Amino acid sequence: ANKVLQLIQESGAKWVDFRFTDTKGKEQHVTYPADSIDEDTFEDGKMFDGSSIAGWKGIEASDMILRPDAETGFIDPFFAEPTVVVTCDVIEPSTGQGYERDPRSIARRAEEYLKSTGIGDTAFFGPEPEFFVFDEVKWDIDMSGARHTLIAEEAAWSTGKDYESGNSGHRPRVKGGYFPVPPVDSAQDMRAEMCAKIEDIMGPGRVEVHHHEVASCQLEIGVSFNTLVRKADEVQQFKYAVWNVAHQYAKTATFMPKPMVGDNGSGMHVHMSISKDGKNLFAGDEYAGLSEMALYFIGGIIKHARALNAITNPSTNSYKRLVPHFEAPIMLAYSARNRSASIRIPYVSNPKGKRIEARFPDPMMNPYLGFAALLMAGIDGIQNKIHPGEAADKNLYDLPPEEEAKIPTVAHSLDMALEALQADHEFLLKGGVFTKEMLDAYIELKTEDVRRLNTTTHPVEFDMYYSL
């Protein structure tokens, strides 16, 4: 590979880390010496067993090392070691979505199923994943019970706790960590290092902004928008960076939504634009400078949202975030200037950008699978000229004139989201981007997560039911 192989030469690296992504959206890695890696290897690939997506088949799939980009020197590890975050998973014959389905290939499929539709040359995604960093996190589940504890200095409740260096008393109050200065912020240099590591990985520029999110211990770093299968890869790399930098500060990072109860959850707003021969088609004048194309994109999403939630909100925990609150994207509507609207139109102040922002996804979403599903739903909108309705700007979450009551909402539970997907999977199967078998599997696999939650008695049930 021009990128990879040359990088190997320049780095004098002895080790090459093949990284791919599982159905649940967890990056995985296997490490090879540089000696085995040739240009032909990008074609031929390196083969391996299937133990996460598949089973029974005794599957001996191949890791077709993908080449352009994602050729990043492993910033954290000691020995010079580039990564190939680009490892599409191919069956032995039919060079295709390996195991049940390789997300990256599903996303590649969707890449083609946009030019093929002749709607657009490229699609651009700009996710805003939120994370929490804690000092330490502990949990256990037995017959004895279930228990989980968050530990952090910056935690709102840490006033009154004893510390080695002493307690500064300077910490964010609940919900009140929106940008206060460093005495209380107690991050900054960490975020900076995170940013520096990102730049090592993806490239120069790319990192837009770093700020403290509302909840105690909650941070946001902004990464530039990119095409799918690029941005998707970069999401995984972002996660990696923040995890490891935190670890170097003896702290732990989690992209889970609502880890903390009674403060803000972590959400992954997804900015979206479509381009054709380098013109953003979302530009127009229909709503606040939106093309009918964009309006159709919207509203396809609204139609298929509940089903989309399985993919965009694929964790039981996601629905802890999706509760009746303001700044909670629960209500399926669109408005540039309304919170609680599931969709927002960010003020581009210039027709060039014209993104649309979907606030309902959380970082638990498999980037590949998630971005793809949004597109499929989006284009179903355009194809079937699905009207997004009229933009509700006036009321976030307030009185019911029957209307807001009548307004559709996002899914209440993963259970429900999976039932939704069962009903409405057609748009995905378009272009053969999503095979039914994959969807079947996915749903069953995710159901085990649901099973866990539903089976395991919750501490709160003691509170409600113990003495009845």
Place this chain on the structure above:
Amino acid sequence: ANKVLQLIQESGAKWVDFRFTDTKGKEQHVTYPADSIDEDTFEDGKMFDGSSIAGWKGIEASDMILRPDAETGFIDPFFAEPTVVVTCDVIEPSTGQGYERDPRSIARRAEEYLKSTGIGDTAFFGPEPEFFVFDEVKWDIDMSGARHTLIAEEAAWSTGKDYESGNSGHRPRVKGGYFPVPPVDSAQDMRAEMCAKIEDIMGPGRVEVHHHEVASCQLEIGVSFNTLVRKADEVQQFKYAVWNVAHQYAKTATFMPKPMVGDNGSGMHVHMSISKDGKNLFAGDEYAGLSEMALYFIGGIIKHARALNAITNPSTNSYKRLVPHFEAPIMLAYSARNRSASIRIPYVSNPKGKRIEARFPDPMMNPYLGFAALLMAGIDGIQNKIHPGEAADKNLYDLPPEEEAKIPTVAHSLDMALEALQADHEFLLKGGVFTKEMLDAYIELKTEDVRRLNTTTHPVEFDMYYSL
């Protein structure tokens, strides 16, 4: 020795560590000054007493310092010190096996026997030994009772445990921990160091891959295939490297199978090939690119498997791995695409280097004895044109269509495996590779292991029987 003696000169080493292997397969060492090491030493050798090898009278035996491939530089000890990882153990009257039997000699024989039978000039072995690394391990047995505890940060059950740097929460789930990214992985750097040490010992290349195995705390490093004897020497060196690198990380490594219950045990798959005049004899068109030769090799293994188990699975603990879980390759048959198959045929993109994999051996095998046993049984197959029967491509396990009931299995216990060996030792005695006296000794010595287990009450015998 051109290698050794020259290395001594080049290293400016003051000491040479002579290493051999005991019956039980544990490398042993004695250290002599380099001044004592001349060319004549290689012929004459150095004298020493008899322990473990069951010497017992006629005690003074000799260490024929051999020449290993780049006789390891210290790679761990203080002074610069070469080790001659190879030191064939030679009897006072004559030259060959000492006391009951030197494994290395047994392996030297059988190298010859292949050529003697004229079926091939060279035999190729490529083991995949799995190991665990724990932070710490404790056990004790008294009259009071019998107790063992595994301690590790990366252990899946360590969520909720207290640590100095504080609990990261980032650790493998049970059976998960197949290739997650480093926050969870933890052992990247350590595996890398292990690899580096291996290369110090066995020189460049030689290291195929490093990944995290399924079980929490379980790691795999891939080492290149080699001839019998050489590969056996390299197995010992691999074990040594991983042990010591772990020790430098203040951790402990064990090659025992199933130390941890209810997650994967550690197994040593053995890739095997026969070559004659530098051509892969296993390549053909009989089954999935297999020569009749290979098919016959397979048959013999299958026939003698239970007896083979005494050598390939020579620990009571081995049989904790070899269980009805369809994961455990207990069923004696062959297929490229079947997990339950004791023997698997790996997909080779090119017919050169066609091999067969025996998944049933575990790292407790004394590689010398055992590479040997595989060959002897293999060639008995070829010699008697033993047909392996049909390949079980269809089904690993179903609602028992009888069939699976009728399917042959490996052995249930070391006890049984030793009984098996007693009955079926003939193939081994061919070539005089294995003396009866050696087998008789082996059996008795390993019986003491069985005695221990069967004599000592086990904690579970309290679970089941205490209140009865």
Place this chain on the structure above:
Amino acid sequence: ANKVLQLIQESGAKWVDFRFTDTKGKEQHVTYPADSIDEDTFEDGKMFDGSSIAGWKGIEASDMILRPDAETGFIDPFFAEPTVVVTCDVIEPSTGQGYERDPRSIARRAEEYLKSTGIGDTAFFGPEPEFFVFDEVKWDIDMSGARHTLIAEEAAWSTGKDYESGNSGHRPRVKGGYFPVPPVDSAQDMRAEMCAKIEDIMGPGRVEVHHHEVASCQLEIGVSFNTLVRKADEVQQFKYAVWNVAHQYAKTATFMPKPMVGDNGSGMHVHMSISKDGKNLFAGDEYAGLSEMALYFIGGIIKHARALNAITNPSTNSYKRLVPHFEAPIMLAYSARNRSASIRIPYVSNPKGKRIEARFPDPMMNPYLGFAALLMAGIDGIQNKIHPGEAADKNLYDLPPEEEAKIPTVAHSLDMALEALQADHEFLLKGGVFTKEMLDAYIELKTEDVRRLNTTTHPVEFDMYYSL
């Protein structure tokens, strides 16, 4: 029931504790009001569910309350509560062994089959169950490992231990503690109370002797022989008494064999006699006052012993006691004055008390199932005139003629015993005493015990295999 119902009247008891035994030989109980209990109850019985074994379509089975030999006025509980130590379990269709098979019924069956063959009117059992009493006992099995710890002041390894009232220094040495006087022997007083409670339960006399057994903390109380079924009921009652009296000393009792390794295990010798017209059939002038009948009884037992072991030694732990040692009745032969002999002929002085003693059974034996199986095997001997061979009181294992290898031994493992039973169940099936279905179930149930042991890594495996 004359006795039960009257007892209820006399006691002014408000409660009746209906007790039966499971396949595994553990007393079970349900407690019902005395108002619920009429004469009709003894005919009709009370219904209950089956989760114990033989999960059916549904297990509506009936507890035929069975007026015992002295239904116990009870002794431990506060409110006066008679127990009907007997409750045969009866199937709704018909009235026989419910579920797989009620042991008590199976035992009654064997009582009848004796008379059916006309060999004898009555069969007599006198078991000598040995137990340990410890101050406290702990164990746990996790992924972390396996542990178990025995704790007692009297334990021989407590010589150096710290005590509240201060260490006396006066305790049994290992194996010593065969009848030292009370300063060392902690159990006078406790054994006495145990005896007193037994008399409460089984009425006056009945208790023959109380002494300290060899091993530290090991005690023996002697209870008079009785008929099959009666004695099996009394076994259960004896266990109950000693358990609960110990609990009143804040201590714990276990009838498990070999709880403590490297001192004596706990064994249940079964003295056996047959009568017809109130005349001892065993008395004669064959050998040490034995009738040919008795000699034939012996033969059958010896013939079927390995299969008998499934019943007489039904715990994996049993084989910790049945280990090649002196004082360990592993050898299948008979003598008056020779140990090592599985069967012994006790010195009666006056015949009519002529018995045979089988020393190989342990207290894990289901008394009902055990007594039964011994009879069936015994009478198969008589029926087929199976010759016991020569009495081996010549010499112990002191002289191995190498024919000692050929000398038959009891089973080495529960696993083996179950394989034995599979092969040799015919004697049991005679008279329809034992259903095939019951035996088939039994075998499978006990296999789970074997599975446990074989699956769970033992502390000692760490000792042997960890650092290899």
